[PDB]
């Protein structure tokens, strides 16, 4: 009647407490979703349950025999292996019961002794409940269920496929507890549609953190906050939580102002004149001392991080022109005889299926890799701002301050360079935590930091390979307004629907066989023309 329990937990890095006195309850066959603002600690909870770190003052009590494996939020760095190799390393704990049974037949290759006869009990002690016999006919099984081929070097797959491999390596062990940190990041609609049935049928229990407001509704039995060191649950469908949470925020805003009201009028009284022979009760001076001390508390609004772009001089009227360009990877064609133009102030959305060449198409435009034929001509006064799929432009060890604005002070903001390191306060970075290595930051925090230093330099051009992977809707809402009003050219890549109906006016819908169909309008308008296509018989 309970699966994982956590009572009186505490986690506090050299900072304000990530986890206060908090509690959790995991039942049989439930899909629980964690919903918290960026940098709030959803991933660190996943590392606590997965038996990975921390929990200084608290007790975790989960039953033995409970196999737990999780899916991380950031793509791995052991990328230089192969797909079957990377997926295999998810059975590391199972690799010991597997290997002893074949090993300790050598002791029984000799005469049967107590040390050799009693062994078969030990290695097969775990074997009764698990399968453990086919950890090669299951790893190759899941791919036929998923689609990956096992012997393709994994340092090659796309962002969507690389994410798929990390969802398999966390599922080879067949865990009773599935912890999915950001499952739908670089997937297409087909993969997301299929995954919504894989997880529903899944026999065990699922805990997942998703920023998809449409994935959560289809699969969320219960929902959990983890707001500011305390986590509280909620009943009902997903839209209920938004309503109940807003009341929690409004009331807490209402009581927060009232406390300041008392403390405001208790500081006019401390410096008032005494009068004639009176004492100024210290039952009120000490209470004011306790009120001033209590102001070292949590700031209920995280702060709606504010941003602004750095417009530069207008680019040439032609940004990209490529005709007769036809680039094809060894097996299949990614782009076959392209012919298109990108003009000034044209906002283009690249959409399509997984691994269809969206990321490599941008690489052709910037000349990262050479076209097989056809030639590409680039604009003449371009100031490119580049947002890769995998960030890859921040070393995880360099400090937060140095990665932002390339290890220099004196950011340029708005008009003239009269700003330094205050550019963090616009992004709700506390100025104390400015020497933190970038690897320590959360996924969404790292997304914004790379976003911050692109809007930090003059630019006539934006290339965004899924810029809104980890951002929450409150921060994503600003990005929709910023990119919309941007005067220069914008080519953005995204796998969600609502976001491209407010920023883009054209689409380059990908098709098989290296064919790209260019439609007009937002996402929904372009898909509308694609039903009514007649393809010029």
């Amino acid at each position: 009647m309970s699966l994982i329990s956590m009572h009186g937990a505490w986690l506090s890095f050299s900072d304000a407490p990530l986890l206060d006195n908090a509690e959790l309850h995991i039942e049989d066959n439930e899909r629980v979703c964690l919903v918290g603002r960026n940098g709030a600690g959803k991933s660190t909870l996943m590392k606590i349950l997965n038996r990975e770190q921390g929990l200084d003052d608290g007790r975790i009590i989960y039953e033995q025999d409970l196999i737990v494996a999780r899916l991380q939020q950031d793509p791995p760095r052991n990328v230089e292996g192969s797909v079957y190799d990377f997926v295999a390393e998810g059975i590391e704990e199972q690799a010991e019961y597997l290997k002893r049974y074949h090993d300790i037949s050598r002791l029984v290759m000799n005469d049967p002794s107590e040390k050799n006869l009693n062994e078969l009990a030990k290695v097969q002690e775990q074997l009764d409940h698990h399968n453990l016999w086919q950890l090669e006919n299951r790893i190759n099984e899941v791919l036929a269920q998923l689609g990956l081929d096992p012997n393709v070097a994994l340092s090659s797959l796309s962002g969507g496929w690389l994410r798929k491999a990390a969802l398999g390596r966390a599922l080879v062990s067949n865990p009773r507890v599935l912890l999915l940190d950001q499952p739908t990041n670089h997937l297409d609609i087909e993969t997301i549609d299929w995954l919504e049935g894989f997880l529903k049928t899944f026999n065990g229990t699922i805990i997942f953190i998703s920023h998809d407001r449409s994935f959560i509704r289809n699969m969320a039995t219960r929902i959990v906050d983890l707001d500011r060191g305390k986590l509280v649950t909620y009943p009902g469908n997903y839209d209920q939580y938004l309503l109940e949470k807003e009341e929690a925020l409004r009331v807490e805003e209402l009581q927060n102002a009232e406390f300041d009201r008392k403390l405001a009028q208790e500081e006019v009284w401390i410096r008032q004149g005494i009068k004639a022979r009176r004492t100024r009760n210290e039952g009120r001076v000490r209470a004011l001392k306790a009120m001033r001390r209590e102001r070292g508390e949590r700031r209920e609004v995280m702060g709606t991080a504010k941003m602004q772009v750095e417009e530069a001089s207008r680019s040439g009227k032609i940004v990209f022109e490529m005709e007769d360009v036809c680039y094809q990877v060894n097996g299949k064609q990614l782009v076959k005889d392209f012919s298109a133009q990108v003009l000034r102030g044209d906002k283009i959305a690249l959409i399509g299926p997984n691994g269809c060449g969206k990321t490599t198409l941008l690489k052709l435009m910037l000349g990262q890799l050479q076209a097989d034929s056809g030639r590409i001509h680039v604009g003449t006064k371009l100031e490119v701002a580049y947002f890769d799929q995998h960030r890859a432009e921040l070393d995880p060890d360099k400090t937060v301050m140095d990665n932002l604005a390339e290890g220099k002070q004196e950011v340029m903001v708005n008009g003239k360079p009269r700003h330094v390191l205050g550019y963090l306060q616009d992004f709700l970075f506390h100025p104390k935590r400015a020497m933190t290595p970038v690897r320590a930051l959360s996924g969404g925090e790292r997304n914004r930091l790379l976003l911050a230093r692109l809007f930090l330099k003059p630019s006539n051009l934006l290339i965004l390979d899924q810029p809104t992977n980890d951002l929450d809707v409150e921060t994503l809402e600003l990005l929709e307004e910023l990119i919309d009003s941007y005067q220069g050219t914008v080519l953005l890549v995204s796998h969600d629907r609502q976001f491209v109906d407010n920023t883009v006016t054209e689409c380059w819908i990908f098709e098989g066989g290296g064919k790209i169909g260019r439609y007009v309008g937002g996402y929904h308008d372009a898909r509308g023309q694609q039903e009514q296509y007649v393809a010029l018989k």
Partner: protein
């Protein structure tokens, strides 16, 4: 039909004794069949833990009325003398699947306690039902006569169903009614002797004697 007649003929909700059921259970035997007995004992264990899972080895004189011709696997000549002494085939270790190309595994386990010529098929296909001989149930022993004596002694394996119920053949109803009581006493203490460490409350939850197509009675 007969199920509608027989459903009144038994009162399985009730409780009975070790002997007031032998005639009570044979009344359903009107049907012409081999009557493959499916005795059922409900066990009390936290079945979905690992440590309490138990698997048993037994010997019974009455047999089951249908012996098993199970090959023996040993690297080299582990089947060159035991094949004629209690095996349908002598499965050579160097040709582990050779004697059983179609049926990679025999009916019974392979007794090569001194021979480690193969873990067995390398792919778990030789463990489809748990045929790998282990010292927990004493299936591994270099003495072929131990497995060879299985045919002359009727070796029967136990099963730990995912709810924790052991099923075994009894020596189908064809035989007498006192031999059933002898059979139960054999499986009673020898399974009490087979009880694992952890337990709670009672150990043997319920007892019943039944068949694939035969009604049952709560023995107790």
């Amino acid at each position: 039909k007969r199920m509608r007649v027989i459903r009144e003929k038994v009162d399985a909700t009730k409780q009975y004794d070790i002997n007031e059921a032998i005639a009570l259970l044979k009344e359903l035997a009107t049907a012409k069949f081999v009557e493959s007995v499916d005795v059922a004992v409900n066990l009390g264990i936290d079945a979905r833990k690992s440590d309490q899972n138990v698997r048993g080895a037994t010997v019974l004189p009455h047999g089951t009325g249908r012996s098993v011709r199970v090959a023996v696997f040993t690297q080299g000549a582990n089947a060159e003398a035991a094949k004629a002494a209690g095996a349908e085939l002598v499965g050579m270790e160097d040709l582990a699947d050779q004697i059983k190309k179609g049926e990679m595994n025999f009916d019974v386990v392979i007794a090569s306690p001194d021979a480690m010529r193969v873990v067995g098929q390398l792919g778990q296909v030789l463990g489809p039902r748990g045929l790998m001989p282990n010292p927990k149930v004493g299936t591994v022993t270099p003495n072929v006569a131990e497995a060879v004596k299985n045919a002359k002694a009727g070796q029967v394996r136990y099963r730990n169903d995912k709810n924790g119920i052991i099923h075994t053949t009894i020596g189908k109803v064809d035989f007498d009614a006192d031999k059933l009581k002898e059979n139960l006493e054999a499986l009673l203490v020898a399974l009490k002797k087979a009880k694992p460490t952890q337990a709670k409350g009672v150990y043997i939850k319920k007892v019943s004697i039944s068949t694939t197509m035969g009604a049952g009675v709560a023995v107790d």
